[PDB]
Structures are given as C-alpha cells and as structure tokens.
C-alpha cells in the first residue's frame, strides 16, 4: 500500500494582546495596511485564549465555520481573504487532496464579552496559525492574520511584538516580528479593568473616518509614532517601568486625542476612564514616581501596566476608589489583599465611585499560539460538526 | 467724586485660544475667533467709583471681596493708569470697584467690564484690547459686537495682539445660541494653568497652532462674511473638538467634556443627520456645558429635541429668548436616544453688541459711601 501514488483535525489557542503604540488608521483598506506601525504586548492564554479547531475531509460538502457555537456566514470578506492567503502562501505530497477538501472550522474564546478585548485579533490569529498547521506552511504567517485583522499579526508572537507598517504597496514586509520574548520581564503585570459602560464605535468604520477627517491623525502617523516606536523599543529592551509606563499613558491619550479630532467624533472613554486615569496619575504622585500606567483600546475599559511589587496595592487604591459591587472581583491572577496607607487613601478622591469598575482580570506577560495534542481539545465531533 | 457703571457681554469662542505663547504679556499661541452673545441675556455689571476719600484700592465680585493684589488685577490696573496719564489729581486717586454677573466666559466678560468701566472713569479712549487681555486673554474680545478676532500679533512687545470686529451684531440676525447648563460635576483643572500644561506637553498642540489654525480663522471669517451655515457650524465644531483633542493629548490628560457632553454631541449629528443637512453646531469651552449655535427657524424644534433626550427634573427650562414650544415628529423621536436632569436648562441668546455705559435709571452697585450697598 506504500506502492500507491498518495483527513486531518487541528486545534490550536491564541492570545490576545494590547497594543502600547496604537493602531488606527489604514493607508490601504483592502490590504490592511497601517498609516503607522504599532507595538503589543501579548497577555498570558493561561487566562484569556482563542481555541480554534480546523478539520478537512474528503467528506464535507462546504466550507462552515463556527463561533462560540453558532455558525457564521462562511463568505465574509476578511474571512474570505484569510483562507485565499493561506492557500496561496500554502501553493508559494498531499498538499492538493487537502485543498481539495471544504474546510470545517469552530472557535471559541473564555473572554467575558464585557472585555471588550479584541476578539478579532486572538481569532485571526489562532486562524492563521491552525491553517497553516492543517496545510504544513512554514514561516511567517503575518500576511494571513493580517488580512483578517490587522492587529491580529502581533498575535502570532509571544511577549513584545511590533507590527512594521511595511513601504510596500503589495503589503509583503507590512509583518509582524518579536522584539522580546514572555520571558524578558517576567515581572510586568497587567490588569483589566471592565467597567460597567456602555454600541462603541466599530473600529473599521471608525479608523477609516479619523483618516479621513482628522489633521491630528496625520500628524501624528507622520512626525510621531516613527520615533515613538524606538523609544518605547528601547524602554522594553531596557525593562525601564517608568518610560514605558509614561509613553504607554502618552500614546493612549494621543489616540483618542486623534478619535476626537475625528468628524463625527468618537468617544472611547467614558466619566469612568476618565476616573481611572485619574486614580492612576493620583497613585503615582503620592509614590513620586511611575508606578503604574494605563491604556485604552476602542472601548471605555482601562488596560493598567503594573510590576508584579504594585499589583496588591493598586486593586487596594481600585477597590478604594471604585468599591466593588461584587465581593470574584479579581479574575486571573491572584494576589493577596493589603491595607492602603492613610496617606494613600487621603490624596485618592474623597467621594468614590462604587460599581464602576465590574471586576478585573489579572494576567501576565505570555508566548504566542500553541498546538494542542489532546483528542478531547477538539471543537469538532468526528463528524466535523461542533460538539 | 465719580461712578459709573457699565455692562459687557460674554463671547463663545468658535476658534478656540488655547495655549499662550507669553505668560506675562499673555500673547496667544493662535488667533480666535468668537461670537458676541447679548447682554439682554447674559451679561457682568461693573461700578467703578473714584475718590479722594478712598485710602486703598477695593474690589467685589458677587457681593464678595477679592484680593486686590492678584497679578491679573494688578496688571489690568496698572495699563489703564499708564493710558490715564497719558491722554492728560485723580491719576493717584484709588478706585472701589463693584461687579456682578448672572452667568451659569466669566472671566473674559468680567475684564473686557472691569476695563471698559475704568477707561470711562479715567477718560480713555481708543481700543482697550491691551489692557483686557492683561486681566484675561479672550477679555478683550468681549470689547466689541458681533463677530470679533484676537489676533495673536507678530510683535513680541504684544501691542498688535489685540481683538477687531470681524463683522457686527447686525451681520447675521438669524443665528441663535443656546447654552445647555450640564447637571453639577466635579471641575476639571483649570484653564489658565491647563492651557500651560498643554503648552509643554502636547505636540498635537503645536501641529494644530502652527499648521490648523491660521487656514481655519479664513475658512471661518469667510463663512461668517458669507452668512454660511453649514460651513460655519462645520468649522465650529471641527475646531471645538480640535481643542478638547489636544487636552486629551496633554500630560498628565484634561478631559472637560463629560457623558452628558458626549451624548449632547450625539443628539447634534443624529438631529443633523434626520433633517440631512447641518441644522445644528456644537461647541465647548473648558467645562462640559454645550453651547449650541442654529438658526432662528431651528430653536423649537432643537429645543423640543434637548427636552426628549434628557427630560428635564421637575421644578422653567427655557431661560432667556422665549420660543413657543413645538411637539417632535414620530420620525425624530425614533432617530434619537433618554437621560433625565442630563440638562439643567437652556439659555438661548443671540448675538449682540460690545459694552454699554449704563444710564442714571440704573442704579450702581456701590451707594454713598463708595461701598457694596
């Protein structure tokens, strides 16, 4: 049987991860090509992953796919353009029966959708990365994440990673690459703060009308992130906490900046983002030093920087500030409660703002996207259906 | 023995001053441009009285008195004695001044009166901008009616950074202004020293002084000239949401617009958007109360919209001009959010003419003896 001439079922996870230098805006919708590059850290998948299962077969009459249980249009135009870059990167043995085969593909993720996390980019990734693990394509699989989400190419590497924006109008060196691995500052922490706000502006629509209506942007993308993208490099490759944390609140505040300089406007942040800033400037003056920074993606939800000797004391300062309607406030990872000091508690804010912050999840610094070898990690019944 | 008394209006800037280039003289980092609302509806009184009998400078504010050596005071004084003398025994006479408002801008009102009323009391003629924008810097765009620049000036010695009459109160007697007094929030940093803050902080400021500007104070003076709504109001708030854009871009952030500005900003382009032209314009200074610019044949309706968006608490909610009440259309009401108290009330205004020496109807603010009475 050797003599003879000539399915398969893969699951993997990824992280999600949060941008330091931010994303926003295209110079090329239809590739997904940034007007700036951008620089992530990717959070830990022993507490927030995307879990994707691929199966081809000669059996499946179509293409279906499925997230978190429900199926989904197979024809969506970014999904559409992941599955053609794949197949062509796959082309660029049993390599033809299996893209002969329709695909069948289920994901999931263990975020709350309160998160706001992006969803998209873990997903693309995990993608990207299980198709190539399903068709053997080796190397760099930014051109396939990308194309579903631009941000979701930062999610194919662990630790720091930076998206090139790329000089090329065909997108080939628009890539992501690492800068450092999970293990280069094991003692970085981050903490969601969910918020209890809330439709947000899609960030699709919404980035293409700041390219469109704000000078700011432009400005920006031209004369600031270039240099940015080397000192926030260099703080990183440095473990210098305090520059990082600044230039991370900087970038953050300077991208809304450029959604409010957007017409219409976009409005991310809301009283309660603005409380957190507030707290966390507030924090680190009484400390007289950086001691903690945030950062918000497209969502009123605060991302809080940390190293690991803060964590306790910050969700004491959160808890005082915002007191918790919930007694499973922390999820994630753990840390023991402290007592604030009275200095502390005196130069927070006299009148607290109980229930704005829901709940936080607690993580760390972690690697990139991970093959599963279990049977039971499938999300597909050996009928190629979900379970 | 003299006392006189006058009033001077508030002005809306709709290109915004944010940011100095010289603390002391107080020279903008960018001309603005504002609108002169009417003291029918908003404005401060002032009643300087000068005396032989007065052994020291006096000055109240609300029925309060103020330290009368505050820089900004001191500064304002101090040029309109300089001009005293030289148009010329009072010159080494002290003054009491008295002033009220019925404000919710103040500052601006407060100076471009505090000057208008010393120069009648002194004598002084010819523009005032010098010695207003000494005491504040939009103060001396309160000086004239209408539509009124501040031109930022070329001179590092200040003396051409001063305010001129674009176009007047009469230009354009269709326009309407409404300001929408947000529910009690805690206040943000304050302007003078955020607007410094910013200054060292935030390169979107510079970008958008040397670079937004200067093109948008033609777009606009010509939209004014023109009698353009649509561009006006366009302009108006691109450059509103510019100026809070490079607070956010500030380190440590000034955000002055709250949710309720925010969903304020949201009833403007939904309205707008119903109706499938620019209707309506936003604008906010360094506060999260909305100031709303439209046409006369827009009031009621925006009015009605303002009062189904956020019903209001109940205990009038239309405070100055009075336009009868309209119901909204099945339509509008659909295409809009509710937050109830979001607004406290409104204040519609037009726009209006410079300061005015008040007649001897009115009585001044200080009695006999040169004291509040």
């Keep these: 049987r050797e003599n003879l001439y000539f399915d398969l079922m893969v699951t993997c996870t990824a992280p999600v991860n949060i941008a330091v230098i931010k994303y926003w805006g295209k110079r090329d919708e239809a590739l997904i090509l940034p007007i700036n590059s951008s620089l992530s850290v990717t959070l830990h998948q022993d507490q927030l992953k995307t879990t994707t299962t691929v199966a081809i077969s000669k059996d499946f009459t179509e293409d279906r796919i499925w997230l978190n249980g429900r199926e989904e249009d197979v024809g969506q135009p970014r999904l559409q353009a992941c599955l053609r870059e794949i197949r062509r990167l796959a082309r660029k043995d049993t390599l033809p029966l299996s893209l002969s085969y329709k695909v069948h593909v289920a994901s999931v993720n263990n975020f709350p959708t309160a998160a706001g996390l992006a969803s998209s980019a873990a997903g693309y990734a995990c993608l990207a990365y299980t198709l190539a693990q399903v068709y053997g394509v080796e190397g760099d699989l930014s051109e396939v994440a990308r194309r579903g989400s631009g941000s979701a190419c930062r999610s194919l590497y662990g630790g720091f990673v930076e998206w090139q924006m790329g000089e090329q109008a065909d997108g080939k060196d628009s890539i992501a690459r690492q800068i450092a691995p999970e293990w280069h500052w094991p003692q970085l922490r981050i903490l969601i703060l969910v918020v209890s706000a ?46 990082f944390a600044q230039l991370t609140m900087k970038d953050s505040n300077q991208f809304h900046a450029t959604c409010l300089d957007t017409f219409p406007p976009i409005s991310y942040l809301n009283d309660t983002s603005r409380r957190i800033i507030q707290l966390v400037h507030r924090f680190n003056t009484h400390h ?47 840390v023991a409660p402290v007592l604030l000091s009275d200095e502390l508690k005196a130069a927070l804010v006299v009148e607290p703002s109980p229930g704005g912050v829901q709940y936080i999840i607690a993580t760390q610094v972690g690697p990139g996207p991970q093959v599963l070898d279990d049977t039971h990690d499938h999300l597909l019944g050996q009928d190629g259906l979900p379970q």
């Design 198 to 243: 809330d439709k947000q502006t899609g960030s699709t629509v919404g980035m293409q009308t700041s390219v469109e209506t704000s000078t700011l942007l432009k400005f920006r993308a031209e004369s600031v992130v270039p240099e940015r993208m080397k000192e926030m490099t260099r703080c990183i490759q440095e473990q210098d906490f305090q520059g």
């Design 288 to 334: 007289g030093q950086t001691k903690v920074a945030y950062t918000f993606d497209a969502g009123p939800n605060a991302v809080i920087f940390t190293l690991e000797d803060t964590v306790a004391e910050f969700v004491a300062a959160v808890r005082h500030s915002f007191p918790p309607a919930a007694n499973k406030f922390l999820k994630g990872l753990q």
